[PDB]
Amino acid sequence: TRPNHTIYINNLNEKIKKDELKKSLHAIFSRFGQILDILVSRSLKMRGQAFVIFKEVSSATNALRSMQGFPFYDKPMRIQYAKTDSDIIAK
RNA sequence: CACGCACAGGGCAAACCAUUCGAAAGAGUGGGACGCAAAGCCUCCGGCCUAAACGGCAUUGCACUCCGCCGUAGGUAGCGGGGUUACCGAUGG
Ligand SMILES: Nc1nc2c(ncn2[C@@H]2O[C@@H]3COP(=O)(O)O[C@H]4[C@@H](O)[C@H](n5cnc6c(=O)[nH]c(N)nc65)O[C@@H]4COP(=O)(O)O[C@H]3[C@H]2O)c(=O)[nH]1
């Protein structure tokens, strides 16, 4: 549970189109601070989950806690501290 | 109608290379020429190739490597059956 710049989210409505998620997560996580990116693959394993990269931890954290169990596309998303740091975060 | 190395006069073009289109398969154009008696034309049937989109299922996945099954949809007529039309006329029991 080491706080991170990026957040893991799952139980995502696998029915909503990639582009749509992208636009609609920014939609509610931008409220918590600038985002450098939101990554999402539609592949068998990476589906149902998105990765949101905030500018700084401070926002991820602020983010996380507030929207846990949050009904998104009639499907309540679990949230967590990304296990690793996205690539650009090195940079 | 069918048949075939009947030498008549022709057609086409595998791999490859260049380039355009497509998610892709693959397709078109250009050089190439493996090999075609229809390797002309047509996707109705079987096979195989691709999964972008569409519908169903499966999946709770910790990624920035790969991304599943069915339907379907496309492609292949140079994978095959089939249909259709065809040049030559050594050959038709
Ligand atoms: N006019 C005519 N003659 C026929 C036919 N069938 C056989 N022949 C004669 O037989 C020769 C060899 O035929 P092949 O074994 O089928 O071997 C053939 C064939 O496989 C190929 N070919 C030529 N033209 C065509 C064509 O229009 N379509 C296809 N699929 N293959 C062809 O080239 C080979 C040699 O061809 P050729 O030099 O012409 O020499 C030919 C030709 O003189 C026919 O339907 N029409």
Query: Whole-number Å distance, CA A74 to C1' B65?
Result: 32
> Could you tell me the residue range of the domain that residue A91 belongs to?
1-91
Map chain A to HEC letters. Answer: CCCCCEEEEECCCCCCCHHHHHHHHHHHHHHHCCEEEEECCCCCCCCCEEEEEECCHHHHHHHHHHCCCEEECCEEEEEEECCCCCCCCCC
Measure the CA–CA gap between A5 and A3, rounded to whole angstroms.
7
Experimental method: X-ray
CATH number for A37: 3.30.70.330
Name the domain count of chain A.
1
Residues 9-68 of A, Cβ under 7 A from nucleic strand B:
10-12, 14, 39, 41, 43-49, 51
Bridge partners (DSSP) of residue A79 are A9
